């Protein structure tokens, strides 16, 4: 992972994506003691991101049908590109965090959104 | 890891966990003394709207303009909130719901202007941008009504010309020890209600003042209006 | 002949005593009320109340502007900027206790930001570094 | 000794509860404020330099003063050295009696009432 | 350097004890404001790329324009953008002076008023 | 540090500094995010004279040929002490604070003071 091996906007994305994540994985502890409203709304968004990416990463399989009763699926690199790049331009901020769990690519999310 | 780190974190802990109780009994403590400051002028105020209801009930021919609404426009929103952070939910509940019917106007497209008593309020409105035509703060916990006179004076005054059409008053309610609500409501036209006190029993005779009776309600309108903001703002700060 | 007297200020009460008789100098100069008198509504002044008693205790109090309602029912005023204090232009007392109050606004913000900040930001970038 | 250590003992531990109180402003119902009080003249009464043994006679002069509270008026701050003058003045005046608590220990009901004589012409005759 | 360097320690080390009061921005005056600004805008100045090693010069005329209070009026972030801009274009425009720094390492006034001029030069009539 | 070895005088005068000192530590600035404008004379002199001692502890020396002839003070003990008790008394709270830094002796800042 750098920039002259895979170019340059795939290491912005991961970069962009791993220092959200350590971000509210240090919030965490000051929301544990105190509360949610004290925050800086900043912070807010960063915590609804930061849930709605860890929740993105989740993927069904194809050799685990038989334990969750689902297809698998899978993904091409640009469209998790896109994705990404997507999510953390703040265009999907209005999606509810429940139609990013299992399943693959921007699209079915969109479609998932709709059918909740 | 280490073990001292947690024996200090656990040391600490056990601190802040007794300062904060302390805190809370502090609270406690305080909590009452607004309740009887608000039950002190809650007669007042009662009276004063038992007045009020004399002073409507005066110069029947007379018509004094607070009482009808122009086209509805250039809406001004009073905000009272706490100086200091810590408050719960109250603040960016209260903030919440004001931006939110502030969309309201901003819906059929209705300018919107806004005052600010709270240390937060001003932190907010400057956050998101506008112009404050008034912005107070440090008032206290028992404000005296001259701290505050300014605001709805220079409000008033403003909206004597007609440029305003009316004031949306903001504040929160107090119902119990645990349970409060952001409120929002309209004070500039006034419509007595239940005050058939001294109307089924009236003296046959006119009172006629000495004073002129024309004028006489004015300066009592104007202190109602100063009143019932006072109550506002105290009943908001021993929610608070 | 006694008279009750209820008139109180926004913020608390002001003065509740029986006082026979009492001389108006707000408006029409010394308006004379008697319990019996009919009733009246007038403009206070920027100036002392006058009221006498049989225990003929001068309970004069000044009181700046407001409006009154006397009646042998009742006895009321607005009580806008008043003291109890005796004579004009004794406020000193009220200054001090403005002074005082003003004194424990600053004591109670000082004890608020000292709790709420400082230990709780202590502890919790305490507990910002992780346990383990 | 046990008829008064109670006094003392039930006084330290009420301090010993309202303790962040003091870091916060006392301002509170008169009770907590009078127990503050109270707490911080009790434990200050407790300080003792080295080398000097207080007797049982003083002890208990020391005790019932505090108990009885005639050491609430003077300041806090000038406690330690007016403890002092007090035994000093009762020392020497009041001798005759020492002898009887310092070898008995009794606590006969007149006992109660020197003491109280006693510390009633300290405080109103002398100076600390 | 050593003529340099302190500003930005004295910078940082003031920047590390305001840090618990991160969360809490609207609660302090105008003045821990203010620091905490200037903390965050050198401690972004202070991140580098792999295999791109500056040189003294680069240094200096970095450092001179955080310390001189020439960074306070962009955004905290493009720091580095304006860094590597500043340094690419005195390589180019200003090289004769730049070799002078790199060979000898003195500070003098001359030296002072040539980093100024630069610095003013590119503030303006160009781009990030 | 003992009251008898040390005298009287000397254990008291070091109680009270280090009382003073410690209680500008709790109070600090920052401590209290109001800064300033607090305790007028109650906890106000107790920053300034926080400041004048910490001040006063700097001590020029011999080595240190640096912007020093060779100076070597050895103080007298006696007027360290009457300088301490001056400045608890504050019979030098005029004294600017900066002249009370690179000071040899209380003489010498006395001196330093009133040249300007």
Known sequence: ?116 | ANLKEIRAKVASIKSTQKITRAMQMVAASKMRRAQERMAQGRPYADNMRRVIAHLVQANPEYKHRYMVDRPVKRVGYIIVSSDRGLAGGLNINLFKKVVQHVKAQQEQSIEVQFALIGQKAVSFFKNYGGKVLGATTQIGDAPSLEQLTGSVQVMLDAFDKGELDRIYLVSNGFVNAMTQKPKVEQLVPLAPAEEGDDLNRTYGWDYIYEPEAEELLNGLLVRYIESMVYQGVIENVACE | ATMQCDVVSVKESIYSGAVTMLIAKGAGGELGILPGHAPLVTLLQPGPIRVLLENGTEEIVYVSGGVLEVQPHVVTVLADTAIRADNLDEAAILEARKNAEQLLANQKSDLDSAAALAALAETAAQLETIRK | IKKLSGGIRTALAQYRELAAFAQFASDLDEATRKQLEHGQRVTELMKQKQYAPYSIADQAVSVYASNEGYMADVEVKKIVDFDAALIAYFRSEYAPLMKQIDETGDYNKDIEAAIKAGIESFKATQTY
Request: without cysteine; hydrophobic residues 45%; glycine residues 8%.
């Open chain 1, 1 to 116: 992972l750098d920039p002259l091996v895979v170019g340059q906007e795939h290491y912005e994305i991961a970069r962009a994506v791993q220092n959200v994540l350590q971000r509210y994985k240090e919030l965490k502890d000051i929301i544990a003691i105190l509360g949610m409203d004290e925050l800086a709304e900043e912070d807010k968004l960063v915590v609804y991101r930061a849930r709605k990416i860890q929740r993105f990463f989740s993927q069904p399989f194809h050799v685990a049908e038989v334990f969750t009763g689902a297809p698998g699926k899978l993904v091409p690199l640009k469209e998790t590109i896109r994705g990404f790049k997507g999510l953390l331009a703040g265009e999907y901020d209005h999606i509810p965090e429940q139609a990013f769990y299992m399943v693959g690519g921007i699209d079915e999310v969109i479609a998932k959104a709709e059918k909740l």
